[model samples]
Target: GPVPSRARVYTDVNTHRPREYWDYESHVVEWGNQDDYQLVRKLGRGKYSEVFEAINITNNEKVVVKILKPVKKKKIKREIKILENLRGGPNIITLADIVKDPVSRTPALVFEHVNNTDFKQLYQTLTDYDIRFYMYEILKALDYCHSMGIMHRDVKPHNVMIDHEHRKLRLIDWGLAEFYHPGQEYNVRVASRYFKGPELLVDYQMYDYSLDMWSLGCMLASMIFRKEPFFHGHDNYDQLVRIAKVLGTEDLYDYIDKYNIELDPRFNDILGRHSRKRWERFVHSENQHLVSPEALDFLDKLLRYDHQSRLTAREAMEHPYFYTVVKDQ
Candidate 1:
């Protein structure tokens, strides 16, 4: 089976448009007319869309042009709406404009051309305190989003952008962002497995914003340890054990008991061990020189085995680890 990619674009939404609207010939000409925009090079391609680095000939300005999947309605609207709702800030990416696809009439969103390097690339560039500085910026971005009542469902290194030249960190990819009203409860399965929170895996129906916090923790761990993603396994059964192997017996069953999360009957032996303590010891013994105290603190809170007890993004920012960089700015 093919693994599904994180983001996918639909050609049309069932909401407003009819099938006839997706005339490929007519749309092709419309998209080609924008050739005056001077497409430079392909930035990156997604499962359903391709992004291009283009120059606006009229204004001599550079922008990212996302050519979308041919479909009846725009799939990028949610991202557009969320970006529109955000105020100008250093931590978030800014949207510039939206282009309509020629045939399917789907929409393409244009955002400021952020640097191409994500956390994965950054890891290859440096280590230690440099990594801590990078993650601190990610926490700041999360804090800003939470304050605005927006929940960024995905929080991975790939979704973060850095302008190391200016020391600016930008969080990109708003396609999964959801708005929450005060005191509202909402639950949806979002984010990749390695970063998945216990609540989402246990019951997709349970609503809480802490899911993103879980991902943040996993991401930080990967950055520091250069380890394989936390929850991966050859199969579903193995995947659960992988998680168990890291957090250990007490935390896993405690989560199952507290949340009533039923696990596959095959692997029940991971009931009493404290895997996190063991992991901490392993880190201290092997990689202590490479790990920073600040990074460790942030990872501890973000990766709490208990979903309900996990730190919120705001609480993470208030921690001394984040204050070191946030307060300095």
Candidate 2:
């Protein structure tokens, strides 16, 4: 049996809310007609949603459109409900309107348009200061979500829209985000593979908001180290093996043992013993400009083996690494 855990902060966030606040399934959505918006260009598509950059023909304003390909009916409500709850938070994507096709009746969530730079390409041009500014902007979005009793389970570059010209950031794709209920067991089949937390790979269900911090750490690691994926694991079992190669296997054993987790037998062939690699080893000539005592120390805290041991979003915001960016924001 796996032991349960709770977020160190905001554990009872939804407890004080009226039942209607947290009961997403019962939410009745008032839809807008699709004729008002004219789809212009395709933005990006995901397994469950079709995204497009569109124009609000009536007002002639630029906007983005997202329509779920269809899921358990409640999945639609859950995403809509959370977006409504988190709309005005810092860097959270603004859901301008909810429109549906009059004839086909396909519901679409309309959002403010962002002229985003493809993250893989964007990372190359980011100066050390730009990285801190944008990463700090993302933390504000995460802190707001956590404060509102939600977890952005899929925290990665793909979901982050960076408008380099305006220097604005919008965290998109709420479809995988979930309402955080303390001591509850959530499906670990969340977050993208490269960004999945150790708790998820080990099948620990009682994880918390700290899970996002680990994914954020991976984003930071890849950006600074020039690795597309800091841990290049081929599959779920290999994901842990990839993580162990850097974070080391000794502490990983202690982490699973403390939580009474039983790693899937698939790991037996791949999870070989390895010593922890030093952070300095990643600071090569090309990426040396991004590495600093504060940056490495901040990253170290976020990529911990234990969820509880990781830095909370707010705590990470106050870390010394953000000292220079704090005044600018």
Candidate 3:
């Protein structure tokens, strides 16, 4: 089949089955003789595990079950700690129940079954209006999470689940997430390169919540353009060059200087190269059809060079792109 335009594809045929949580091949746990729950089909997979559509063995209710694939003991413990600290809201994917794999010692978390599908599904099926609507809902949810001092380090299309039946949006996947305490130093690098904020790529050591805003911007851009975020590099080194090219190395340096930010030693190679004109060419030539003025403006704010110059989630919610449509007040 010919590659369809961004507006055409709705479902991703490339979706894969999630890996089993832990080494289910070596260790097994019976569902406690409960034949009530039926394994319908594989939903999706991630770095740690696979999720499936399941029904309550006794009550016959539907639920989304996440089985962790085998991982290091430290990672497993971290997952448990993050989940334990998580407090769900309407926009957040709520945890229904949790259980441990008797054999592999893997942990499984059950969440409410969402109907619409993941962001990939929405991108395939919904039109331009759907993209905006989805962003509005996601931003609102992120705002709520940020207010709670929780930094959702990894924010991407796959992490955002939708319920088409209810027309609701929920944020899932807290794998790289960390809780921010007042005046405590945060040391963790989390998030994808394309959706990653400048602060993360440039300086992963410093603490900041603006990283989420940067990622949110990337998510919105990807959905609007129906393309991968930063589609410029195959590796981290190349990715930074791509970023410097589009945003301009000087502009980036200015922001770093003004904010007194520290960058990783890896970024020194391309610290002062001028690459904005090249970036403009890439955007217009490659993504001309999909880039909307409103969308570009929103992306600009989200992909700002300086962390301090970036808008907060609440501020982004107030932007014209979001207000363009009032949600039936």
Clashes of each: 5, 0, 11
Q: Which consecutive 10 residues in model 2 have the weakest lDDT in total?
A: 116-125
Order of candidates by lDDT, top first?
A: 2, 3, 1
Cα lDDT tens digits, model 3, 1-329, are: 11111101111211221233222233233333223446678887877788888887767789877777645545554555445444466488776666664544566767777874786656644655667788888888777766655668888878888876677888888767655443334454568766766665655344456778777876766666556655456766666677777787888777666656656677776555765653234355445655567767777888876655677777787877766556856
**TM-score for candidate 3:** 0.77
**Stretch of 10 with least lDDT, candidate 3:** 2-11
Query: What lDDT score belongs to each candidate, Candidate 1 first?
Result: 0.63, 0.89, 0.64
Off-target runs (Cα >4 Å) in candidate 3 are 1-44, 69-88, 182-188, 259-272, 275-292
Q: Could you tell me which residue pairs clash in candidate 2?
A: none
- Measure candidate 3: CA RMSD: 11.0
Ranking the candidates on TM-score from highest down gives 2, 1, 3
> Tens-digit lDDT track for model 1 on 122-188?
6545556666677667777777766555678887777888777776678987777765443334554
Cα deviation at 114, candidate 3, in Å, is 1.6
Give the number of the best model, judged by lDDT. 2
Q: How many clashes show up in model 3?
A: 11
Regions of candidate 2 where Cα sits further than 4 Å from its true position = 326-329
C-alpha RMSD of each candidate structure in angstroms: 8.3, 1.3, 11.0
